[PDB]
Design a protein around this ligand. Structure first.
Ligand SMILES: O=C([O-])CC(=O)C(=O)O
Ligand SMILES: O=C([O-])CC(=O)C(=O)O
Lengths: 437, 437
């Protein structure tokens, strides 16, 4: 007897693995895994292996798997949206949380539970309508989300003294609600900014997560909803040790609720060095669209690329911290591209940035990975579907990234992972360390 | 000729140190400071030396220094305010930023520039009047912080392409505007909340920061304006390692501006395992004040203690992260209380924990530090001056906590410290790490 619910599922899973890493730590706490050096401790933990985190692992060479589900494994193994071909993101939140690949049914449950949870508090909406147009879609988007910590069941619980065991639970209810509300506040920025006067409407609970949002933005093309579904699966989880995810993990660990703890992280994502770069290639691209002019040879186009380099600047959408190969999450976006829009002026000037850009960082050897991003090529497809307001681009990114981040958050509070308290050192005293000692 | 301005000092100071830590890493990049072990990796970076950080260092046995300045070296060598005895925190910001203890003038300078730079934008005020009474003053707080970043100069600079070199420079001006406006905002949340009705009126430019605050809080006791100067000193910096400091430092490294990058941390501090536990000694202190009753022995007091311990709970104001000793920030406030409230109920019982609690954790050795906090102590004094809404206490903290955060941040953007991209490890891949390899 009985039917579907991720909570039950978890209550079975959870323990088995508390035991499981316990035997591990019994045996191998004893183990020196890496080494800490002065360089790393000057250079922002690059290679310094700091976290445990389950909800994804990146490979330099291969990259992002999701159980070990490589995006192309997911692409075809996670369930599709009744009339489409894309990885539909309830099937992904399924995957990461349980290590299992779902039933379509067991996603429908998901959809219709999120878009049951999917109701916005008076005040949020007030505040949101008050937001001045001069205010970034993202400064906005945290402001609401940091104010959404009114609906927080966990934060409610604690202050009345829920017992340690439990913790994972209530944050299962808060998260589930936040991923649910998220979209509406995504859409409800966009529309108070860019189409400024019209309603973000109803929720058909006989729609999926992705699609509700497409409706709520006021976008009408079927095909853009496949794209949307698709972004919404590859921006999701991309290991721990990135800014946003690491933030959230961290502000997570002092037992601050998932509302507060997401919206700490989008300020993670807000960082032009984290998220903005999305938005920023097509900044450049309007910049190259002007300032180098309409139609160029790869010479002034390379002089333009030299352009910005020499001007001390930031070359977004090429290279990557730790990814030493092609981001699957480009290649991912390509085959989507080749398949609905191969006819585009910025599309194929993306198969043209596809042979010139890095090679100016090969000329340079700036940082260690010459190959394509995810920043790159998403922008180009947004425009195609007539998403053009490139500030809003990282509102999108947070919406997809909401999947990941709350995903581990449930796991850390079921796994009792303590408080994120490093050791920091001073220069002067580090000077006393290495040499003076 | 010419007069006072931290900026000028900075442009002499900054290079000297770039060069400095330059040589240092040419020689000692190659130096391994210690080890990465699996328990550290499953147990929250405990000893796991992850930073270099300037504006303060904390020793186990010794605790907080500021340059090498202990709280007591401070209490005196730092300039005090015009008929009063207390470390005046414009001289504290001074200390950290420059490496040098100030002059009373260039604290006059500092006061004066702040009380200039504390304008408040329209749209803050709107939304701060829109905050409903069942938000916390810190959910309330951040949201209006993260909005405030519309008044980010650096956030504007970057959009147009300032040069890398320049970076500290714009974050100078943003932070200074922050630490400036911040308390107007703190005060405005109190006053919307608890004082429900009345304006937060003046800023008298020839007053001091802490003074003007007390003035806008509605608080007319002279004595509470010492305690304040003082509080605001010892809640400033406590190295990098902690949540709020490390959070900012993080979202900082992502070239997100000061506002966006403070606010994230304050949720970091909003954590019950962070800052809320001011509030939650006095949480239990109404739960002493009822539930074991008015006048008790240290039996059914001890009982009291053991009861929430066995109920698995958290016991605030005792123990700590890294401090294996009696906080300087305790003994600091002790010497105050001795001088202005040796008559109190909740004082002398504030030494009534002062031989009982950790002893039951000495029964337990629950964690590794027997001697007191700062959360311990403060919150008794605060009712002593008639601040009582123990919710707000943790708004109190972040006001102080804006010094140190905006403090290091400036030195990070001038030292051009990169972006904190650590390495996260999953279980199963940890599993294949240690033992399988
Ligand atoms: O891992 C990185 O450094 C950032 C990244 O690509 C992500 O957060 O998706
Ligand atoms: O360092 C700790 O973990 C917390 C602390 O005392 C502080 O943030 O002031």
């Amino acid at each position: 007897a009985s039917s579907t619910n991720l909570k039950d599922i978890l209550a079975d899973l959870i323990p088995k693995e508390q035991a499981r890493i316990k035997t591990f730590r019994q045996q191998h706490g004893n183990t020196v895994v890496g080494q800490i050096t002065v360089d790393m401790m000057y250079g922002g933990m690059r290679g310094m292996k700091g976290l445990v985190y389950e909800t994804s692992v990146l490979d330099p060479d291969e990259g992002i798997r999701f159980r070990g589900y490589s995006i192309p494994e997911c692409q075809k193994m996670l369930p599709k949206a009744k009339g489409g071909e894309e990885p539909l993101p309830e099937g992904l939140f399924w995957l990461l949380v349980t290590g299992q690949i779902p039933t379509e049914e067991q996603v429908s449950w998901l959809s219709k539970e999120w878009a049951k949870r999917a109701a916005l508090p008076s005040h949020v909406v007030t505040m949101l309508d008050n937001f001045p147009t001069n205010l970034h879609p993202m400064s906005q988007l945290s402001a609401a989300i940091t104010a959404l910590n009114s609906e927080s069941n966990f934060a409610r619980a604690y202050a009345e003294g829920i017992h340690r065991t439990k913790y994972w639970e209530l944050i299962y209810e808060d998260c589930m609600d936040l991923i649910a509300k998220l979209p509406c506040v995504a859409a409800k920025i966009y529309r108070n900014l860019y189409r400024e006067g019209s309603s973000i409407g109803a929720i058909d609970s006989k729609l999926d997560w992705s699609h509700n949002f497409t409706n709520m933005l006021g976008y009408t093309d079927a095909q853009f909803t496949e794209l949307m579904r698709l972004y919404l699966t590859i921006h999701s989880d991309h290991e721990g040790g990135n800014v946003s995810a690491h933030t959230s993990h961290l502000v997570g660990s002092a037992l601050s609720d998932p509302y507060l703890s997401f919206a700490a992280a989008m300020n993670g994502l807000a960082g032009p060095l984290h998220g903005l770069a999305n938005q920023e290639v097509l900044v450049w691209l309007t910049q190259l669209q002007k300032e180098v002019g309409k139609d160029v040879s790869d010479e002034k186009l390379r002089d333009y690329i030299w352009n910005t380099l020499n001007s001390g600047r930031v070359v977004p959408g090429y290279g990557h911290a730790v990814l030493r190969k092609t981001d699957p999450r480009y290649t991912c976006q390509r085959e989507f591209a080749l398949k609905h829009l191969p006819h585009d002026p910025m599309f194929k000037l993306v198969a043209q940035l596809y042979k010139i850009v890095p090679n100016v960082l090969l000329e340079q050897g700036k940082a260690k990975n010459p190959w394509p991003n995810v920043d790159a090529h998403s922008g180009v497809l947004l425009q195609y579907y007539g998403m053009t307001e490139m500030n809003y681009y990282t509102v999108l990114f947070g919406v997809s990234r909401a999947l990941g981040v709350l995903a581990q958050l449930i796991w850390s509070r079921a796994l009792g992972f303590p408080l994120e308290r490093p050791k920091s050192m001073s220069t002067d005293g580090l000077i006393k360390l290495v040499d003076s000692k």
